[PDB]
Each structure stands twice: as structure tokens, then as C-alpha cells.
Ligand SMILES: Nc1ncnc2c1ncn2[C@@H]1O[C@H](COP(=O)(O)OP(=O)(O)O)[C@@H](O)[C@H]1O
């Protein structure tokens with residue numbers, strides 16, 4: 001009864017001070033929406049990030065979840081790959097299924 | 107041994123948590139996890155939001171989406187379906 | 197840009213056992229992990245209503261760990277004695293990454 005369609009889902013983990021840079025990249029590519037998980041902690045190649053220890057909550061690591069059509073993955077990584085060469089963080093690309101492609105594509 | 111399951115991520119406004127968890131309960135979902143205090147961008151609006159995570163057998167997907175359909179046609183929110191594997195002792 | 201396959205674990209457990217799980221990941225050679233705090237849940241991750249049960253008052257966390265496929269087996273074997281005594285679960289995802297060297 002409810003048809004499912006393929007989509008991609010990015011999990012972008014980075015320092016909160018770079019939130020605007022990441023969301024601007026998403027908005028420019030035509031990404032329709034995103035969800036942000038705040039105050040994260042994590043282990044990186046050069047030390048620990050402890051969200052609870054930050055004096056400014058906006059400085060803690062964040063995870064931006066963005067469901068995007070496959071066509072947007074390439075242009076998005078063109079922007080994110082060079083950012084990650086200069087700053088901490090990672091992007092994980094997932095395959096997902098959604099019920100409403102029009103909510104995610106245009 | 108690895109077994110296939112479907113993992114749902116159901117993102118919606120916290121005000122509708124009770125409806126969503128009751129639906130999961132009524133469908134026979136065995137357990138769920140809730141990620142709170144989320145923010146985000148959606149169709150006409152910036153944001154409390156929550157994300158409910160539920161791993162279910164593939165057979166439960168269709169009936170759950172049917173149950174969520176009237177809600178999602180009237181309210182903000184998204185559902186992402188993932189193919190995952192879970193390990194169970196042999 | 198080429199993408200390369202990798203696995204991604206989402207380990208859900210009580211925040212009280214954070215150190216056990218992170219020590220197990222470090223020892224197995226996992227390069228990094230992300231911790232999502234202040235989670236809550238209800239029900240069980242076991243085969244039935246009673247097994248590996250969580251209540252709304254339990255403080256949970258989710259540990260996200262991108263790992264090479266070869267580490268999945270040893271990590272699940274490592275978490276097995278823990279999950280017979282404590283509630284929680286490991287969801288294994290397929291993911292694609294640009295830099296597999298950062299993770300393997
Ligand atoms: N293997 C991984 N799985 C999950 N999260 C990861 C992984 N590697 C890195 N991360 C996340 O990315 C953050 C930054 O990692 P990284 O770029 O290596 O930082 P740095 O080297 O500056 O300490 C980590 O704190 C963690 O939140």
C-alpha cells in the first residue's frame with residue numbers, strides 16, 4: 001500500500017562552530033531539510049571532544065542528518081571533502097528508503 | 107549470526123511522542139529508543155523535535171507506515187527506513 | 197568523488213557502561229567513535245517482552261562507530277557477554293565514506 005523509494009542519508013559530524021558553513025553547503029545544493037543532534041562527544045585521531053565540558057554549548061560537536069537524492073551526494077562531498085582536509089569531522093553516506101520523494105527532491 | 111532487520115528513524119515534534127509510541131506499542135514493536143532535544147530545517151520552518159529509533163522485522167514496516175500515514179499527511183516529520191543487521195548468539 | 201564501503205555500528209546501552217564499550221572499541225582497533233547522549237527508551241532488544249529490557253527512567257547513550265567490515269565479527273563477539281547481563285543492542289549498517297584510511 002505505501003510505496004517506498006531509494007534516497008541517501010548523510011550523517012555529517014563536525015564542530016558546532018562550523019554549523020553555518022555546513023548548513024550553507026546543504027542549502028546551496030538544494031537539500032530540503034536536515035536534523036541536528038547537538039552536544040555530542042567523540043574520539044578523534046588527535047584527541048577527545050567532550051560536549052558536556054564546553055562553556056559555550058554551540059562549540060560542542062554536532063551531527064547533521066540530511067536525507068538527500070543520490071544526485072546531490074557528489075556536489076555535497078565536493079564541498080565537504082576539502083572542508084574535512086582542513087577541519088575535524090567525518091561524513092557517513094547511507095542508503096535509505098522514504099515514502100515521499102517530493103519532500104526531499106527539488 | 108547476523109540477521110536482517112529494518113531500522114526506522116521517525117522524526118517528529120515532541121508534542122506527538124505519545125501518539126507515535128502508542129502506535130509502535132500497538133503494532134507489536136518490541137523496543138524503541140528516543141533521541142531528544144533535536145533542531146532542524148523543514149518545509150516552512152526552523153526548530154522541540156525528537157527522533158524515535160525502532161528496529162523491526164521487514165513484515166512490520168508496511169503496517170507501521172500505514173498507521174503513521176494519516177499523521178504524516180497532517181503533520182511535520184519524516185520516516186527513514188534502513189536495511190541493518192543485528193547479531194544473535196547461535 | 198569515489199566512495200568506499202565501510203560498516204557503521206550504532207551501540208545503544210546505559211550511559212553507566214560507557215567506559216566498557218569505548219575500551220572494547222579502542223582495544224579492537226576502532227579509530228574513532230561518536231557518542232549521542234541523553235537518550236531514553238522503552239521495551240526490549242531481546243527475542244521477547246522480558247529479555248534485554250529498558251525502562252523510561254534509564255539513562256541511555258548511542259555510540260556510533262564507523263569500522264572496517266573485518267572488525268564487526270570480533271566486536272559483536274566482544275559485546276556478547278555484556279548483552280546477556282545488560283540491556284542494549286548493536287545495529288550494523290552499510291555505509292560509504294570518502295577516506296577509508298581514516299577508519300582502517
Ligand atoms: N570511526 C568513527 N566513527 C564515528 N565517529 C567518528 C569516527 N572517526 C571520527 N568520528 C567523529 O569525528 C570527530 C572528529 O574526528 P577527527 O576528524 O579524527 O578529529 P581530530 O583528529 O581533530 O581529534 C570525532 O570526535 C568523532 O565524533
Ligand SMILES: Nc1ncnc2c1ncn2[C@@H]1O[C@H](COP(=O)(O)O)[C@@H](O)[C@H]1O
Nearest residue numbers: 033034035066067146147148149182183
Ligand atoms: N531532508 C531531511 N533530512 C533530515 N531531516 C529532515 C529532512 N526533511 C525534514 N527533516 C526533519 O523533519 C522536520 C520537519 O520537516 P517537515 O516535515 O518538512 O516540516 C525538520 O525540522 C527536520 O528535523
